[PDB]
Amino acid sequence: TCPFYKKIPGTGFTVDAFQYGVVEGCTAYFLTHFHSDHYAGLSKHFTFPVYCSEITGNLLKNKLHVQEQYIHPLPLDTECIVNGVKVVLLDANHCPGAVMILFYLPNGTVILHTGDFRADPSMERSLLADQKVHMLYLDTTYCSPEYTFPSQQEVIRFAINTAFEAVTLNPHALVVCGTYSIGKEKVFLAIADVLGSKVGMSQEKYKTLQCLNIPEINSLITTDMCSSLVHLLPMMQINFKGLQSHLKKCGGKYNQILAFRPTGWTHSNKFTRIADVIPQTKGNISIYGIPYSEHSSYLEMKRFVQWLKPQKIIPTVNVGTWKSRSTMEKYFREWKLEAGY
């Protein structure tokens, strides 16, 4: 059944709760972002109001064929009334169109649901600074101190320099980047930009990217693989067998592949810097795993929470085991005692 951490008390609202059938009592279904664990269950047959960002609304219409009459897009940073309750959507710094939701309950309680986010000090100057938040429904994906990772900017610098050097040394090398969802577009766009190429991709992925309101996107992406030297493939195909096969398909236009797998965290993060990453190589194929995260590090999450000072924290990730739940609750207490709230 629908878990309590997907229900907003004092409202008829749920968040990211589309795979339980009809949630009894639910008058409005919010969707924080277009990732499959969150939208699982939506389709053209859904007949309840869905509230979301503009970009998530484009993807619901165009990729899932949800009917327009049930899609209710809200602008960001704007006080809106939904079934008599004031709400605000904020940028979550996750994938395109991903939002956090501020609920102002009729009784005076204020609730923030982060959806999926990567906490950032810029959030300390949004509409969150303007009033107290009593309850926080928190993206705890990486809520443990082993999870460090570099800034997004450092990771893109590494990828740009690596690609540029490889292709300038060998003009017959192909760059491949893996993907299995929206997000992490900066990886492949920034590489294609330094190389003066467009990124080539399948028709289905091209359609997905045209839903994202990215400025000048017609200038950066294409479905013509032949004119492109940065290809996007399913993440499943980013391995030596899948890459050798793809190389055959290019007809001897290329003799070398340099591939990027933008992973979340991998245990080389506890030992190795970004400056010191190396690929896996077999023959003329090299694969780089790069730690490009769209979730908070442990320290970024801790700062955000110690700044916000909520009265109650409700984790939405890693909640399935007692040992995980109990460990997170221990960090939350440390944070509160260190900061004095």
Q: Which residues bind Ni ion (CB under 5 A)?
A: 35, 116
Q: What is the closest distance, in whole angstroms, from the C-beta atom of residue 98 to Ni ion in the complex? A: 7
- Under 8 Å between Cβ of 284 and 314: no
Q: Which is closer to Ni ion, CB of 11 or CB of 296? A: 296
Q: Which is closer to Ni ion, CB of 116 or CB of 200? A: 116
Q: What is the closest distance, in whole angstroms, from the C-beta atom of residue 76 to Ni ion in the complex? A: 18
Q: What is the closest distance, in whole angstroms, from the C-beta atom of residue 95 to Ni ion in the complex? A: 6
Per-residue burial over 59-86, b = 16 or more CB atoms within 10 Å of its CB, e = otherwise: bbbebeebeeebbebbeeeeeeebeebe
Of the candidates 274, 304, 340, the one whose C-alpha atom is nearest the C-alpha of residue 142 is: 304
Q: Which is closer to Ni ion, CB of 116 or CB of 300? A: 116
Q: What is the closest distance, in whole angstroms, from the C-beta atom of residue 93 to Ni ion in the complex? A: 12
- Under 8 Å between Cβ of 38 and 59: no
Sign of CA dihedral 269, 271, 275, 280: negative
Q: What is the closest distance, in whole angstroms, from the C-beta atom of residue 14 to Ni ion in the complex? A: 17
**DSSP 8-state assignment for residue 125:** G
The rounded distance, in Å, linking the Cα atoms of 93 and 33 is: 11
- Under 8 Å between Cβ of 232 and 206: no
Q: Which is closer to Ni ion, CB of 230 or CB of 317? A: 317
Name the residue type at position 184. K
Q: Which is closer to Ni ion, CB of 38 or CB of 198? A: 38
